[PDB]
């Protein structure tokens, strides 16, 4: 019943998580100077819609055509999901052996790879 807090702990202590980056403007400003492969941040969906079934975390990264983001959700029992932001349908993500950040890193960087190869 408390596994959500352990998943949040794993995300929020990681250096990729940027607690002071909230708006789209701040994301653009961040990647103006940063060479980081991706960031994690507090998603807009937390204050936006739904009625408290997930805690929402967004990833952001930059390719040659601009900034791309991915929305993730954690449910009350600690399960991870990728979230389609246009339909809000969820898709479960199984945690890789080395843990949650190891999982998100693979989901984000492989997705960035698909984007870059299509450009």
């Amino acid at each position: 019943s408390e596994k959500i807090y352990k998943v949040m702990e794993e995300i929020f202590v990681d250096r990729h998580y940027k607690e002071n980056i909230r708006t789209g403007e701040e994301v653009k400003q961040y990647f103006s100077k940063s060479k980081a492969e991706f960031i994690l941040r507090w998603s807009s969906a937390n204050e936006s819609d739904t009625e408290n079934k997930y805690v929402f975390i967004a990833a952001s990264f930059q390719a040659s055509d601009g900034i791309h983001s991915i929305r993730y959700g954690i449910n009350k029992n600690g399960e991870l999901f990728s979230i389609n932001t246009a339909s809000n349908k969820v898709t479960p993500i199984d945690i890789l052996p080395l843990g949650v950040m190891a999982t998100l890193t693979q989901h984000i960087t492989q997705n960035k790879e698909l984007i870059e190869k299509a450009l």
């Binding site: 807009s44 601009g66 900034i67 791309h68 983001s69 991915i70 389609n84 246009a86 339909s87 898709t91």
Partner: peptide
């Protein structure tokens, strides 16, 4: 923000 959406 442009999001990566699958389904």
């Amino acid at each position: 923000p442009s999001y990566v959406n699958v389904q």
